[PDB]
Amino acid sequence: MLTEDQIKTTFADVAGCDEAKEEVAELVEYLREPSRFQKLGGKIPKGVLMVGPPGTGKTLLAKAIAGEAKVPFFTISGASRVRDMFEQAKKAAPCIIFIDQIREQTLNQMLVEMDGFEGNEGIIVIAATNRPGRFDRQVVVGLPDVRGREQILKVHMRRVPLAPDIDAAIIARGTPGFSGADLANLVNEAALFAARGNKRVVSMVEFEKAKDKIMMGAERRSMVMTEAQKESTAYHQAGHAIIGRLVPEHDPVHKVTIIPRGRALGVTFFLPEGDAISASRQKLESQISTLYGGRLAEEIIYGPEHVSTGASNDIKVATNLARNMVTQWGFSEKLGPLLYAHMSDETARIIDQEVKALIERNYNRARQLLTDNMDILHAMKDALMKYETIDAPQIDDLMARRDVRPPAGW
Amino acid sequence: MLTEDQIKTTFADVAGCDEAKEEVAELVEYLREPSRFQKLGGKIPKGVLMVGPPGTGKTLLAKAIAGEAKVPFFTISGASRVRDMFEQAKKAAPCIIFIDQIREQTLNQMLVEMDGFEGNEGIIVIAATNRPGRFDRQVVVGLPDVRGREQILKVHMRRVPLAPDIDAAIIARGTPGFSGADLANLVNEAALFAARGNKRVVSMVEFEKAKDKIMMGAERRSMVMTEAQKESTAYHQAGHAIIGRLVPEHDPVHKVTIIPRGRALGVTFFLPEGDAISASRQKLESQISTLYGGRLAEEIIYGPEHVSTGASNDIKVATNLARNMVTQWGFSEKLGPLLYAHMSDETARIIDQEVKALIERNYNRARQLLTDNMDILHAMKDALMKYETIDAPQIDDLMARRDVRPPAGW
Amino acid sequence: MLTEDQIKTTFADVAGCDEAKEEVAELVEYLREPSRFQKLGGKIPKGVLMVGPPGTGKTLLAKAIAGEAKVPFFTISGASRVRDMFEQAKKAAPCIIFIDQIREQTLNQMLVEMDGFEGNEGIIVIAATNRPGRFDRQVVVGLPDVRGREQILKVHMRRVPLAPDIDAAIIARGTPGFSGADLANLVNEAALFAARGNKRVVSMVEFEKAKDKIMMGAERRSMVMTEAQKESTAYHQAGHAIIGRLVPEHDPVHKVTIIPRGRALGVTFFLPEGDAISASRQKLESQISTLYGGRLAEEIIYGPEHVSTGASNDIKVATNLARNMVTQWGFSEKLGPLLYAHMSDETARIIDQEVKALIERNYNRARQLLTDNMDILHAMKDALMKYETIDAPQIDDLMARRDVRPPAGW
Amino acid sequence: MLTEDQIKTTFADVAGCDEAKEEVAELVEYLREPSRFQKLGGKIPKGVLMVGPPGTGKTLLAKAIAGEAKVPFFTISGASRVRDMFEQAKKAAPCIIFIDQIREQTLNQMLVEMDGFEGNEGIIVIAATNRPGRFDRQVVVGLPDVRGREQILKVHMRRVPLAPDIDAAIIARGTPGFSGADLANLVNEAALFAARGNKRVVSMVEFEKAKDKIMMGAERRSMVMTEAQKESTAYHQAGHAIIGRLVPEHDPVHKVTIIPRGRALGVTFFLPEGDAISASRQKLESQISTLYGGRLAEEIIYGPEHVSTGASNDIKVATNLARNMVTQWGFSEKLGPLLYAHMSDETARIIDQEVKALIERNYNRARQLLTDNMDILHAMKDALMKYETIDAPQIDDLMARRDVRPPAGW
């Protein structure tokens, strides 16, 4: 299943993954001109394995390779019968074979062909899926860094007009772990979204709209909630916010919103402001106090008899983070640095008492902060209603004990 | 499988799911008039996934809109032999392909040739079942909300006479989670049920009968219960009704019955009365209290050793609900807000003492309530025995301590 | 299925495996001059199984021996239709058959009848895969030793020039457990690496580069990390280092790195310095202290709060190693020499107490070293950030408290 | 399936297995001369399956069956076509059948029909595998007892020459459970082994070599071990030998060696000195003691912190042997004669106390024995280093505190 082509994918079109690009260009240089290797180039690399995560160009270096070198054929893909592949891939074979449908005589057969019946054409296997000599060099095609996000976003950005306010880095930042595909969609749906309202110029506003519709369910506004339900979910979806600021070393607050998306009643967003190299104990502790903040915000205002089963998911991740700290990253003085993840019955008790002590300490801190800053909570409950959504400039105005400015737009 | 029809029924047929309706009418307008590539990147959306629960219009929309643009095709289907037949879709298309026979390279493997041979029709592989680029848009098709229940009900309600007193919403609330087929054939069975007695005009009187039949089971009077057995159930199903009222923040009572249907001697119905997102501590404690109404009625009236295995299913639900509160949804002072749903034996016993304390507190509140209002219980036993069924207005008469009007009908 | 030929390459090819070499020259001698066995040995050695580890010369021996005795065909290999094929290979044959596609008791009476038909051919089923009379004689093909590693390295190093300063043995001990194949690769990639920069011929300077590239990841340099971040990961690696030279009986240090090579920001290499024959109590405890020494550097420099979660994989290695001592090899005075690998709940508590005592003693000792040698840590932190890599000679310079000389090259 | 030979191998080569051989010779005589039915033996055994362990002649009594009676037929060895079989078996062919090829009453049905329809051939199905009428008999083909080892050895020992001082029984005891194939090729490899050095006649000196190459890996002298490593093993293998003698009722020591063979640096051999019928408490305690000889030799000689993980495999067998005695075989005063191999936690504690006490008592005895005889340990350390191997006479020389003579040979 191989086809002769004239125009196909090159290398300069792909972005990011510079190391993978480097190994690709080495293979491309090699594919012809073997005489350059007077140092015994020595069995042109046989077998290339990409163990990268699925979805980020795991097979785009294959397309790039097939187009590259002016070798006019592609992957050979697109049981037993491989030997017919060995037979056909001897004459006029455009320098590779790529085999992704995910019994290893391929090594002996390929060696025999490349030694006897192949005039240094260097047809070798390169494969992608998710011992030395059969898979010698394995090249990782990984998820882009934020720098890479900027590049790819600019690359697909060619096709449209731009309104002045576009800042590619922020849009890149908000997509942690989005592949090339996900960015491609972000742009595409920006275009579609702008068309829906028939807007000539496309700016960052609909851009954020598209990002949101991607990660979370698209806005589902037709649902009705009573007057009081709108009010309660406004406190709980604040409180998350007023704590995100006062606790130390946290990702800053980007958005606080109230209209339901998918299965969620309200959302508070965060922006990593970098890539996750590692975490401090301090910031890990701060996360907990931000998480439970909503339930406390709901209890102080309403009474402990009316606190609702809305904090279920907020509770779960909190308890999951808590026990990881004690169990498998050190972080507890009594037990000491060890890995407890068959133990005794006494040990199973000390682990629990430590977990409870941690959550209790931060829960008290979270309770203390809200009581002192009561004016903000009422001030922020109000604006959350008058306008349905709050951006970053507005939140800072609240947190400074000042007047709220109207949101961007409206 | 291609089926050629010129014209079909309009888009008034689908009701509810307005968000899905929107995210689909964009596709509908796109299918033709692709000249709107003035955003200059508007490449066709992708295979669209409808990932709702089975049973709620997952495929209904097809006929409403496939009439639009007069596409002479349908769902294409209605172990990879397709590929060629997949590439068949280049002439007289519906501007889609639909596949609900529900490995992963199939989409992008053929999409290039698709759009290359697609006449700007916006062909996609929209699919329904229970990495962007192979599937991008996942559109929820959810169960009709209590507002949407009215819309669907009035849609299928164009085919009959109507009695003056019919109210749609009351039937709406009675069917929580009923999908479209449920409502449609509820109307259908209303029609049939009226016809069986040869009553001229349908009405709510049998409408509720149809609901009750489908939801629970046909009422079986062919059973014989002795005289002394009709009396015992009469108390149990009261007591449920007496305590459902005096306890705080409960769904209100609709009707109370004695005729045996399915496997249960008596049923007490509650009306959710306005869909609620989530519940609160007070409501859950009210439910735990009300569930134990019957056993206490039996125990006081008949003695501590004539109680029976009738509260078997009432017990299980109660102890399940009480177990969820302390383990998952916070709601206990001693243990704290944490997910307990492994652990030490000391912790294992605290949870048991906690659930026991909870059940006991509400059980005693239940007994103290029923003891004081002794007369109501007897007064209500008499009515259930005279007329085998009591409606909502009658209960107000009993609870006010005045005489009972005869039921509507009779 | 067998391949006709005339001659093959000599016996200088296979290196090491001298015991296997002998127990193969037996078959080589036997296949010819069978009458030499006047001591009635001429009961042909039946199926010979090579039961070595995979990837280390399991099937390498083909060329030398198939050439010797001038046997002209290879293995036959290259659900039992075979038996006729077993009949087929009895005249003018490879002199034996080899079959690596790995009910089975079928071998004996079949090839016995054949050898009765064989004109003293002595054909056997010599088999490879990862009772007497069918698999009586098996010849192991083990992982190469250091004195063997060096020789294989010299053999494949017949095909290029070398720069004067190459010591084979250092590269030999650098590759523990890797086969002939991995050494083949090391040389091949050395050639390529030299070619890439257009260097005339290669010393060991890039030889180590090839080792690092294969055993670890390639130098993923393209990443950026802030200045304040490198300083965090450069106080850590120095701290596996200075604590690995003040403890007794440890493997010496070779390199320390700051440039990320995969999943790790830093690497500290140790040179095994001899093949592993088992171990000693002192050496195991010293390893335990070396591992935990990294995170103590962070704790002293930045304080107990800002101690990151990068010390994770260090914790696991230590807790398994410390657990294995008191559960499998004796090494605990309280419990005694025994194998605890059910068991009571009292016995489990003692085990955790012993594991914790071990790790506590070594943790405290690894702390007592850095506090006294604070001046080394700062100095080694500077160099690691000045030049990204430190060679062995400078580490000695630092550890002696004198001025640092620049690296080889630069 | 079909093969006729007028004359084949007899049964006098069956040496061994006298008892089953008799039950077979009964049948052999009966196959013809049925006229001895004057007690109605009219009932040839319908089916007897040799239920012995695989590997010991389970197919050699069938071959004897075909040979005997001068009856011209080979047995059928060599999903139901069996009806073919009981069809064909009527051509004046008596009792010449075997089935080890690979719907349940089939054997009895066809057998009855044919033997009723056959001319008194007395046909029976005999099978080999690992209610009378389908399998009436079961005959055991067991492993050769120490008497029978002599018979098989003398049978195969005709071919070679004999050296003067070869003793069969000593080789016999050396192979505790080798089935006839193992003895046969032990002789074979004796012949081969002599041939390599090309000696005139084969003494037992090489016979020990053949046994050692079979039982454990062949000598691997190619390994190089440092000087200080040869001294370490030299002590551990002694110590095993010193405590083996001074402790009561043990299998005596045969040979003690240092050159590595397999995965073990040293091996100490014992001779069972008779068949292992059943063992007693004194003997089992002797074993538990002797095993821990090596670790104590290391600990006294070098120090309490230069011990190693070499006693890893000595520990395990010890804790198994000690665990069986308390749990399965009585042999403990406190718990009593019961099978403990579920149960309360208190009981789990008692068993560990007991196992620990047992190991402790014998360990202390082992220490006290060795310290008193310190000179023997040194004197025996020297001999192992000088000559790599010590035989039986030398151990007596050491233990009497005299001068050592050199081994046979050298």
Ligand SMILES: Nc1ncnc2c1ncn2[C@@H]1O[C@H](COP(=O)(O)OP(=O)(O)NP(=O)(O)O)[C@@H](O)[C@H]1O
């Ligand atoms: N560096 C990149 N620049 C631009 N687009 C990219 C890049 N990497 C991946 N893509 C996208 O990937 C698509 C095709 O690559 P693809 O076959 O998906 O490999 P992949 O993305 O890793 N899929 P998968 O097999 O799950 O890993 C293109 O159409 C792009 O949208």
Ligand SMILES: Nc1ncnc2c1ncn2[C@@H]1O[C@H](COP(=O)(O)OP(=O)(O)NP(=O)(O)O)[C@@H](O)[C@H]1O
């Ligand atoms: N929103 C709706 N409005 C009107 N009728 C509906 C609606 N949803 C479902 N129906 C009825 O349900 C049927 C449509 O069948 P179908 O498309 O299978 O729904 P579905 O049950 O969600 N699909 P599935 O879950 O796989 O069985 C028709 O009889 C419709 O009258």
Ligand SMILES: Nc1ncnc2c1ncn2[C@@H]1O[C@H](COP(=O)(O)OP(=O)(O)NP(=O)(O)O)[C@@H](O)[C@H]1O
């Ligand atoms: N002793 C050796 N000397 C030289 N090259 C060797 C040696 N052992 C292995 N090789 C190389 O390794 C390959 C030998 O064939 P191969 O079938 O891989 O044995 P193997 O590596 O053990 N394979 P396997 O063990 O079945 O996984 C060839 O590429 C040889 O060049």
Ligand SMILES: Nc1ncnc2c1ncn2[C@@H]1O[C@H](COP(=O)(O)OP(=O)(O)NP(=O)(O)O)[C@@H](O)[C@H]1O
């Ligand atoms: N009593 C005996 N005297 C001599 N040789 C014997 C004797 N018993 C078995 N053998 C040898 O055993 C071999 C045949 O063994 P075999 O028929 O397989 O028994 P078996 O090994 O149990 N069959 P199986 O276990 O199913 O593989 C021949 O080489 C015989 O020489």
Ligand SMILES: [Mg+2]
């Ligand atoms: Mg891909």
Ligand SMILES: [Mg+2]
């Ligand atoms: Mg469906």
Ligand SMILES: [Mg+2]
């Ligand atoms: Mg192999």
Ligand SMILES: [Mg+2]
């Ligand atoms: Mg056999």
Ligand SMILES: [Zn+2]
């Ligand atoms: Zn929340």
Ligand SMILES: [Zn+2]
């Ligand atoms: Zn009830």
Ligand SMILES: [Zn+2]
């Ligand atoms: Zn570390």
Ligand SMILES: [Zn+2]
């Ligand atoms: Zn030992």
